[PDB]
Design a protein around this ligand. Structure first.
Ligand SMILES: [Ca+2]
Length: 440
């Protein structure tokens, strides 16, 4: 194949930028702070469940919602002994409370029968409920977005929505049921990979990693959008042998492309790089939360990784910030190790781009603790605040199923300062486990 250059009109996580991160991450400004293990508790109301990926009910701009005097957090939870047991639970606290013990458990959002009652062909084949977002609508409704995962159908992932009906009193919140429960998007082949394309390759034994998940709701000028984890399709730079010859994925210069591409082609990461075509996708929704328009990806990670998770985007003090989490173990970049886990980040003057890397490289947070460390954290997520230069970073702590007495739980939150195209972790800014806002 001959070298070429094609950006497909989207932004790219380039090899040159990623190569700078191993040295840069030694700076404490870009590091998840050390946590004190003797302060860490299980979520008392979870009654022995692992509780991992979590997200707050948000207003349209990403700030934390107030539902009838309560904060609400949705989270994946399940039996630590069963890695395929994943359902969405709803936790809640009175606004003003900060202790992890303040989080009550309203239980599962869904009954097993809900996916059938929905009259939705894709939903009736669901086996797990994976991550998403939740927005608090202008008419006072809890509008959930999540990932319908189907183990029956080779790990199909479908962006899904429902309204969660919740009664509020002075003491409790109670889930009454759901409505408007429907599949929104399962890929289109041309812009975002679908599960058939995964099956074409030989599914899991191909080494390909198909994703279409973690939908994050946001609005701009009254238009409604989901930004989500995906993989590219056939028309915006697909996986394949030819992808390694696209200079847009390398950056820097032709000299760098020649050197880096020849190294990659000679390496044991050639196949991994060919398969790697992660993307942060975007769709516009209609006012009833159905699909209006498939839009081009905000950014892609061709050759670098197939898996960029927990898509997040919001406007803060005049700029738009786009984040994603990614494991070094699934990357193909020299100097990045299997211990390294990142939140990467990008900035634009507009929701729809173009996005350029924060801190020159894309690095925002680095966590490299051993998987066995009780204070291991993952699924880092920046929660915008109503005012100021800080966001709150939430994450889950402790790997699923590792310890009998220490379950996956809410990590201590901490602060990230954002100004312009730069970020820095705020010194000694550790908050309570699962704390969503600085204000209280
Ligand atoms: Ca792929």
């Amino acid at each position: 194949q001959k070298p070429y250059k094609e950006t497909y009109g989207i932004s790219h996580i380039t090899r040159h930028d990623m190569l700078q991160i191993p040295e840069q991450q030694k700076n404490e400004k870009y590091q998840v702070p050390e946590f004190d293990s003797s302060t860490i508790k299980n979520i008392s109301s979870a009654k022995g469940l692992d509780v991992w990926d979590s997200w707050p009910l948000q207003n349209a701009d990403g700030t934390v919602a107030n539902y009838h005097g309560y904060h609400i957090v949705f989270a994946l939870a399940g039996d630590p002994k069963n890695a395929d047991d994943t359902s969405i639970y709803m936790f809640y606290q009175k606004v003003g409370e900060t202790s992890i013990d303040s989080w009550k458990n309203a239980g599962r959002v869904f009954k097993d029968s809900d996916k059938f009652d929905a009259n939705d062909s894709i939903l009736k084949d669901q086996t797990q409920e994976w991550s998403g977002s939740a927005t608090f609508t202008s008419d006072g409704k809890i509008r959930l977005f999540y990932t319908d995962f189907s183990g029956k159908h080779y790990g199909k992932q479908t962006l899904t929505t429902a309204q969660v009906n919740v009664s509020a009193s002075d003491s409790s919140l109670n889930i009454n049921g759901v409505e408007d429960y429907k599949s929104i998007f399962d890929g289109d082949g041309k812009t975002y990979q679908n599960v058939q394309q995964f099956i074409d390759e030989g599914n899991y034994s191909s080494g390909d990693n198909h994703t279409l998940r973690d939908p994050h709701y946001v609005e701009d000028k009254g238009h409604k959008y989901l930004v989500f984890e995906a993989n590219t399709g056939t028309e915006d730079g697909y996986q394949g042998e030819e992808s390694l010859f696209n200079k847009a994925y390398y950056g820097k210069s032709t000299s760098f492309f020649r050197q880096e591409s020849q190294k990659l082609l000679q390496s044991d990461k050639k196949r991994t790089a060919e398969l790697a075509n992660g993307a942060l996708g975007m769709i516009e929704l209609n006012d009833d939360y159905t699909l209006k328009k498939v839009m081009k990806p905000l950014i892609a990670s061709n050759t670098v990784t197939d898996e960029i998770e927990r898509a997040n985007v919001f406007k803060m003090n005049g700029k738009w910030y786009l984040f994603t989490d990614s494991r070094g173990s699934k990357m193909t970049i020299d100097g990045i190790t299997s211990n390294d886990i990142y939140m990467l980040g990008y900035v634009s003057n507009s929701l729809t781009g173009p996005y350029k890397p924060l801190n020159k490289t894309g690095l925002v947070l680095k966590m490299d603790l051993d998987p066995n460390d009780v204070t291991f954290t993952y699924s880092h997520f920046a929660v915008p605040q109503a005012k100021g230069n800080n966001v709150v970073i939430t994450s889950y702590m402790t790997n699923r199923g590792f310890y009998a007495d220490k379950q996956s739980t809410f990590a201590p939150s901490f602060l990230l300062n954002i100004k312009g195209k730069k970020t820095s972790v705020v010194k000694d800014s550790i908050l309570e486990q699962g704390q969503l806002t600085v204000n209280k």
